[PDB]
Structure 1
Amino acid sequence: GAPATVTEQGEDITSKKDRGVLKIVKRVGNGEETPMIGDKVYVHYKGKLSNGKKFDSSHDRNEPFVFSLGKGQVIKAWDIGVATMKKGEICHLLCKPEYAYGSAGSLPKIPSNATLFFEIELLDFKGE
C-alpha cells in the first residue's frame, strides 16, 4: 500500500542523505514557488503508524493545521518536507523516528521509535 510504496520508492529529501525523510509527490501543485522560512503554512494531513492505525487527521476536524515553517513547531520531517512543497501539492512522507518523535514518542498514540507515514496537502502559505 501507500506506506510500502513511499518506503521503497520515495525520494530522500534530507540534507544529510540519511533516508530519514522520504517523499513522493502525488499531486503536482501550482507554479514553482515553495514557502519561505517563517511563513505561515496551512496544511491538511492524515498520519498513520507502521501498524496501520491512523493517529491524526485534520480533515476530520474540518480545519487546517497552521504553523510557522522552519521554526521547530512541528517534527523535523515536516519542516523539511513542507518546505519542498508547492501550493496545491499533495505528497506522501515517510518519517523515521529521528525526524519525528524519537525515543520519547508522543502520547496518547505515538509509541517510542515510531516511523510515521503522512499524506499532506499544502493549502496555502503567507509571509506574516
Structure 2
Amino acid sequence: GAPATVTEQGEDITSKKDRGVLKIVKRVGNGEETPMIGDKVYVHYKGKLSNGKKFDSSHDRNEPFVFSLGKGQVIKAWDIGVATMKKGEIAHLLIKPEYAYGSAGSLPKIPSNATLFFEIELLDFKGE
C-alpha cells in the first residue's frame, strides 16, 4: 500500500543518491520556503516498520514532535526529509536501515536492518 507506492514513485532525497530515503508529497503545503538547518520544526507523524509489526504516532501522545532540523538529534532520514518539506505538507517517507537504526536496530521497538515508513505533517517551523 503506501510503502510500495513509495518504492515505485518516491523521490530519492539522499546526497549519495542510494535510494536509502524515498519521499512522496501526499498533501502539498504552503509557503515558498522549507525550514533551514537549525530551525525548530513541529511535526505530527505516524510511523511503522515497513512490515507493519510495530507502530507509533505522535497523535498517540497528543503532542507534536519537535526537533532542530539538520542538527543530528534524530535519525538521518528525518533530518534530510523534513528539510525538504513545506509548512502544511504531508509526506510519505520510506527509509532503508542505513538512514535509520542500521543493523544494530533498537530493540525492542526496532529490529536489525528494519525499513521504516512515516507519514509526516509539517505543522510549523521557526528560526529560533
Identity score, percent: 98
The answer to whether the Cα contact below 8 Å between 1:46 and 1:54 also exists between their aligned partners in 2 is no
The answer to whether the Cα contact below 8 Å between 2:43 and 2:65 also exists between their aligned partners in 1 is yes
Offset of 1:110 from its aligned partner?
0.6
CA deviation string 1:38-80 (max 9, x = no partner): 1110000011112212431101111100000111111000000
Q: SS of the residue aligned with 2:77?
A: helix
Q: Considering only aligned residues, what root-mean-square deviation do their CA atoms show, in Å?
A: 0.9
TM-score of the superposed pair, with normalisation by structure 1: 0.96
Match of 1:7 in 2: 7
Q: SS of the residue aligned with 2:121?
A: strand
Q: SS of the residue aligned with 1:80?
A: helix
TM-score of the superposed pair, with normalisation by structure 2: 0.96
4+ long deviations beyond 6 Å: none
Offset of 1:105 from its aligned partner?
0.8
**How many residues are matched?**
128
